[PDB]
Amino acid sequence: RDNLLGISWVDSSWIPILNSGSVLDYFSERSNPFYDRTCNNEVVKMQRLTLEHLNQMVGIEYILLHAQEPILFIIRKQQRQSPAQVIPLADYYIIAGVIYQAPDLGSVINSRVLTAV
Amino acid sequence: GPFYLMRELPGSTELTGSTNLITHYNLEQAYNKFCGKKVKDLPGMIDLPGSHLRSLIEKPPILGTMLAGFRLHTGPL
Amino acid sequence: QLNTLNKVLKHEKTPLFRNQVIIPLVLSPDRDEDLMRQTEGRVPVFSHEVVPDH
Amino acid sequence: LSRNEIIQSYLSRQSSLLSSSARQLHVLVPQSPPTDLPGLTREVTQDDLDRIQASQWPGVNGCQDTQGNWYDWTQCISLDPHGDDGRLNILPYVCLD
Amino acid sequence: ALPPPMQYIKEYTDENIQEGLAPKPPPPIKDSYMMFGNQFQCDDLIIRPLESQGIERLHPMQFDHKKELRKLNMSILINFLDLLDILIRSPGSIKREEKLEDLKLLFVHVHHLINEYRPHQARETLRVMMEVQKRQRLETAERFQKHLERVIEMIQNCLASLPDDL
Amino acid sequence: GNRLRFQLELEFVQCLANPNYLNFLAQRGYFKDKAFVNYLKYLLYWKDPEYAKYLKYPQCLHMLELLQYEHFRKELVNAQCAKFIDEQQILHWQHYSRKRMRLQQALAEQQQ
Amino acid sequence: YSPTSPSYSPTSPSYSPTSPSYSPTSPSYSPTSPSYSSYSPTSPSYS
Amino acid sequence: RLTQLQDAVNSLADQFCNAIGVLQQTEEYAQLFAALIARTAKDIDVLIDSLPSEESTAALQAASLYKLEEENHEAATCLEDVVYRGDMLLEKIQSALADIAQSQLKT
Amino acid sequence: APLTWVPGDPRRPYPTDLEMRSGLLGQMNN
Amino acid sequence: ARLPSFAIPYAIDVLTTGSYPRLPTCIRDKIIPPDPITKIEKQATLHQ
Numbered sequence: 001r002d003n004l005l006g007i008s009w010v011d012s013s014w015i016p017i018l019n020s021g022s023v024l025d026y027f028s029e030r031s032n033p034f035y036d037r038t039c040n041n042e043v044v045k046m047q048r049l050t051l052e053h054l055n056q057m058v059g060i061e062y063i064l065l066h067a068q069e070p071i072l073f074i075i076r077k078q079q080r081q082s083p084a085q086v087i088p089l090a091d092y093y094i095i096a097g098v099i100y101q102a103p104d105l106g107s108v109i110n111s112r113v114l115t116a117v
Numbered sequence: 118g119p120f121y122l123m124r125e126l127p128g129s130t131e132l133t134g135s136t137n138l139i140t141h142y143n144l145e146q147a148y149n150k151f152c153g154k155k156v157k158d159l160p161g162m163i164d165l166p167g168s169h170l171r172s173l174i175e176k177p178p179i180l181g182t183m184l185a186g187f188r189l190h191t192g193p194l
Numbered sequence: 195q196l197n198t199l200n201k202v203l204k205h206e207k208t209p210l211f212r213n214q215v216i217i218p219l220v221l222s223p224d225r226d227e228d229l230m231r232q233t234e235g236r237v238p239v240f241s242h243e244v245v246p247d248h
Numbered sequence: 249l250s251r252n253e254i255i256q257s258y259l260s261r262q263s264s265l266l267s268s269s270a271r272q273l274h275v276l277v278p279q280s281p282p283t284d285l286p287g288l289t290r291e292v293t294q295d296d297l298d299r300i301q302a303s304q305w306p307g308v309n310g311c312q313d314t315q316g317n318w319y320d321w322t323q324c325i326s327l328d329p330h331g332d333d334g335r336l337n338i339l340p341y342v343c344l345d
Numbered sequence: 346a347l348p349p350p351m352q353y354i355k356e357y358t359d360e361n362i363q364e365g366l367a368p369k370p371p372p373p374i375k376d377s378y379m380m381f382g383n384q385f386q387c388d389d390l391i392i393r394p395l396e397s398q399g400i401e402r403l404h405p406m407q408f409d410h411k412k413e414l415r416k417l418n419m420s421i422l423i424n425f426l427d428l429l430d431i432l433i434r435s436p437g438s439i440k441r442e443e444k445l446e447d448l449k450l451l452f453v454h455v456h457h458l459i460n461e462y463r464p465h466q467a468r469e470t471l472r473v474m475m476e477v478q479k480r481q482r483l484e485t486a487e488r489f490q491k492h493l494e495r496v497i498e499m500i501q502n503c504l505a506s507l508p509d510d511l
Numbered sequence: 512g513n514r515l516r517f518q519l520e521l522e523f524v525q526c527l528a529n530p531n532y533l534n535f536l537a538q539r540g541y542f543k544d545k546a547f548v549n550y551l552k553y554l555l556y557w558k559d560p561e562y563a564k565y566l567k568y569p570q571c572l573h574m575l576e577l578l579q580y581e582h583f584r585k586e587l588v589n590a591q592c593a594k595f596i597d598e599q600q601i602l603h604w605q606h607y608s609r610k611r612m613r614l615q616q617a618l619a620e621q622q623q
Numbered sequence: 624y625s626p627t628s629p630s631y632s633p634t635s636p637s638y639s640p641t642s643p644s645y646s647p648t649s650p651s652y653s654p655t656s657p658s659y660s661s662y663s664p665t666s667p668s669y670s
Numbered sequence: 671r672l673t674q675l676q677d678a679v680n681s682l683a684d685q686f687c688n689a690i691g692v693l694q695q696t697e698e699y700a701q702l703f704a705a706l707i708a709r710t711a712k713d714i715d716v717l718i719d720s721l722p723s724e725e726s727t728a729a730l731q732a733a734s735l736y737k738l739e740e741e742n743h744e745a746a747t748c749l750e751d752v753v754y755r756g757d758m759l760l761e762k763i764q765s766a767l768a769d770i771a772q773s774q775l776k777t
Numbered sequence: 778a779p780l781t782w783v784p785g786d787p788r789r790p791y792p793t794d795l796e797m798r799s800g801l802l803g804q805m806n807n
Numbered sequence: 808a809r810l811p812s813f814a815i816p817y818a819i820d821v822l823t824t825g826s827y828p829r830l831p832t833c834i835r836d837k838i839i840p841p842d843p844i845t846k847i848e849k850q851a852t853l854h855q
Contacts, residue, residue: 008640012795031346106211122420284726292733307722337619351803362546371556372517529791538635573827603830608778667784
């Protein structure tokens with residue numbers, strides 16, 4: 001919880017069972033530090049075959065953005081004020097069943113320059 | 118039984134794919150009448166019996182006489 | 195010089211950078227000649243190791 | 249799981265046949281009632297130890313085959329059990345590099 | 346969850362940070378239960394566990410592997426033909442589950458016989474290999490013996506060479 | 512107890528056969544400490560047959576010897592090192608097995 | 624010093640990682656009725 | 671050999687499963703499937719006809735390994751005894767070549 | 778070597794990280 | 808269910824000798840530098 005950018009979480013048993021909706025499910029788990037046990041994404045784990053929960057009423061949600069079938073599966077965290085209104089919060093990208101948080105442009109540049117100086 | 122192996126023969130049964138329902142339930146006459154009707158509808162019979170709403174009827178199916186007689190006035194025009 | 199040159203440009207009026215978020219689209223094992231030549235020979239054939247590493 | 253395409257089905261035949269594969273078949277080995285230790289309690293007969301090292305023993309040191317060619321455990325036997333051009337090739341039992 | 350890629354170096358290394366004589370010695374051969382990886386992997390066990398543990402045995406103690414494997418190959422083809430026969434008569438008959446279960450039972454006995462063969466092969470390999478080693482040593486010794494005679498042949502050639510010069 | 516010591520040491524030595532864990536330890540700086548080299552020198556008791564009898568993954572022993580050369584630990588901090596060593600290990604393994612099999616089969620089929 | 628591969632390596636954990644819990648062991652579903660009314664990023668080198 | 675036998679047994683089943691699957695899912699398919707099954711079945715039979723009833727493996731195995739140990743010892747002695755005397759040759763015969771070389775250089 | 782071992786195949790010669798995490802050294806030290 | 812081949816020469820190399828003679832040696836050739844000879848063989852090679 002010190003720095004979410006500097007944490008990686010995985011589960012080798014989950015890695016064989018992985019592709020598309022599977023990714024949403026893995027993220028949905030719970031123990032992943034990025035996933036919140038509060039917000040709305042917890043209640044989609046409670047709901048069944050939901051197909052539009054992010055629109056009519058709103059809240060913090062996690063949705064797949066871009067997907068490559070074998071490994072690459074990018075997830076985006078949105079905060080909706082109303083249907084047809086989306087506010088992007090952050091992006092968590094999964095490479096080879098390893099979840100990282102997408103580094104900011106300015107934050108990454110500045111920290112690495114500090115390491116170089 | 119030194120040989121071993123040698124398991125059970127199934128035993129013949131009457132339920133098979135062989136008998137079409139035409140022969141299985143003796144509906145061989147219903148299929149013949151269907152073919153005859155196809156070679157030769159309800160809407161046609163209705164238009165022949167009468168001059169010539171369906172959604173309302175389907176929805177309905179899914180779900181002081183003297184004053185009524187006198188109330189006739191203020192119409193027929 | 196380039197520490198200060200870089201820093202001045204950064205602190206000069208600019209669009210917010212913490213806003214933007216870097217996301218990778220595709221990773222393929224096919225030989226890359228463009229990527230290699232662009233990165234001056236270093237880091238070629240965008241593999242899986244290279245995105246957690248960089 | 250539908251498969252059944254003429255092409256998909258045709259691939260199955262070639263792959264399965266490759267792994268599996270006038271008689272040219274191995275000589276039928278009659279069963280031996282006494283084995284070297286328990287069956288004949290012959291224990292070690294120096295003769296048995298001498299036979300295994302140099303003599304041809306039909307099943308202890310090799311496979312006889314038909315046509316008389318003798319194939320030792322290290323060697324690979326090529327034989328044609330079906331009456332067809334394709335020949336079953338039996339790889340070495342020991343395969344000591 | 347909370348766990349990382351396992352806890353890092355600790356305990357034995359802390360002990361090891363000493364000098365000359367202070368570190369603890371090696372542990373004794375725990376001849377009992379251990380926990381490598383996740384499996385117990387306890388000691389004192391066989392190589393091919395009897396099929397009697399976990400499944401039925403359709404083969405008598407005579408077990409002439411070569412004859413029983415041939416019978417089991419036949420039972421499997423005949424049982425497949427019977428499964429086709431259940432399909433002729435009643436696909437839904439209770440026997441269909443039994444025939445599907447009985448064919449699998451047969452495929453497993455063949456693997457148990459193959460497991461008997463693998464030690465039959467380990468035992469044979471332990472027996473041979475030293476026979477090839479034996480022949481290679483005798484041949485290498487014969488080569489040296491022959492090379493030495495040929496070296497002595499060279500010695501006598503050198504003797505011929507002294508008169509050859511004279 | 513000595514039982515827990517034996518079990519933890521067995522698990523650690525079997526885990527050392529992983530190039531990923533080796534690169535982990537090398538990057539985290541555990542190798543630079545003079546305590547870990549003494550621990551490795553003590554860990555050489557596994558070469559005895561009575562101790563090697565309990566080793567499920569034997570690929571570790573040879574690797575352990577390399578760790579004593581004092582130049583293997585200075586390097587291997589790179590990820591390309593783990594890449595290359597795991598590549599060669601899995602290549603030796605799979606190619607040995609499948610190449611023996613395929614060579615035997617192909618020669619038996621071609622000679623016929 | 625090694626084959627076709629990114630020509631750069633770093634300090635230690637570009638990012639530090641973690642892991643889940645023991646998976647072999649876990650709870651159950653315990654449900655109730657409504658009462659009554661492609662490629663491969665594997666180490667094997669690609670051709 | 672044994673791995674090939676296991677794979678052949680597993681495939682014998684492969685052609686059964688596949689045959690029935692095809693059926694549930696034309697004549698040439700059944701013909702080739704039948705030929706496939708019969709071919710692989712005969713191959714499994716002729717492969718089993720290989721590994722034997724076998725015997726010894728201890729009684730003869732133990733006797734043979736003991737004889738092999740004795741003969742390995744005696745062969746090691748013979749090869750070394752030859753070797754001590756073999757290396758003896760090169761030892762002072764190269765010093766005889768060095769004596770000739772010394773006499774030639776001293777001239 | 779597994780007959781079906783393939784480049785995607787997870788099984789590996791080192792002790793495998795996943796087995797180290799569930800392994801005693803990984804958990805008992807924590 | 809299939810059981811596989813035994814280690815055989817591999818197990819022999821394991822139990823008797825420890826120096827693994829399998830896999831690649833390129834590990835040691837590329838990572839570990841060679842150990843230098845002492846006077847015993849330095850001058851020996853000198854005189855050969």
